[PDB]
């Protein structure tokens, strides 16, 4: 979609790749199917972590 | 099509190479295209052809099969230093070799003007014989190629310096009266376009200076598009270049304040239509945009790249490729 296709643009335009703007944490834990990754709260807050900036 | 090009008769993001959607590695046969519209009436079929510092042959190509030449003498900085380890590869411009001139060539088929081309690159062992700063390479090239044998010259040098004169005077040694010179110059230091404007009408005729539309739109990049001057009875390359420093030091630039007014006014309206469209291009995302450039590059042998570095699947959902990264980064 334009919207995302435009906050890629502006993402790149720095210089970098932000892995936010093509899919959320919530759009992965729906579109995934449920294991035993991403089930604990600790285990769900680290991926959060590690889904952002970081 | 894009021919918001113009020609003068005498830190940002490369979003502009959105407009460059064909080619293996380097594509300055872009910038080219618009040299072509040019140069293309006039004759430099005859004679040999030169490339300094071409690097990846990419122009080289796309020049070669609308304008072939008898004899190509390709040039590039190489050491062997960098060659993978048992492997003893020559500069080959790895783009040329893929493209319509060298594909005719190894197979023996004539070329347009019905002469086979011979390619010799200019390589013979010393990293600083590619190095044109070096008089030493400059030597050999004009050992190699012999003095008054080529017609066009194709001198891309990225920005005087050692290299750009040595380049300028092995063109005026080499070319036939009568020959072409491209030359890849650049605007925004304009005491040195002074300074190559002055050298270069010393000994050539109908200078032009063109701006390429599909050049970066903040660069001030100057293709210079020069006819060697037939009989130049010019006494020698020094006495060019310190009375250009003289000019230069004494005097205003050879370059009227109208001409300087004229490629400002035509390149600030180029530069915002340009980016409009690069703008449009990446918003739009519309499949088919200026089908005759790209028609170029594929009879030029071009072909598009992406499908070897992404061998992605096409999803035609945006769903499903959401959900393929959902596995993806979860596994």
Known sequence: ?54 | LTEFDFILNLPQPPLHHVLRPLGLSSTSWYKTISVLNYISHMKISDGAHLYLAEGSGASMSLIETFLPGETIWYNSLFNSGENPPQRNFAPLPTQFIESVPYRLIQAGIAAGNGIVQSFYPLWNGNSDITDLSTKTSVEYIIHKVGADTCALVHVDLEGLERAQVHALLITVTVLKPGGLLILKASWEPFNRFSFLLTVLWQFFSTIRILRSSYSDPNNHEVYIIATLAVDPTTSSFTTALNRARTLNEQGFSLIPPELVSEYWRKRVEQGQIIQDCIDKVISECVRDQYLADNNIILQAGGTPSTRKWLDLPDYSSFNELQSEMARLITI
């Open chain 1, 1 to 54: 979609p334009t919207q995302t296709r435009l906050t890629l643009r502006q993402s790149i335009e720095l210089g970098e790749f932000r892995l936010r703007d093509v899919i959320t944490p919530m759009e992965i834990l729906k579109l995934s199917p449920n294991r035993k990754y991403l089930k604990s709260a600790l285990n769900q807050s680290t991926f959060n972590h590690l889904m952002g900036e970081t």
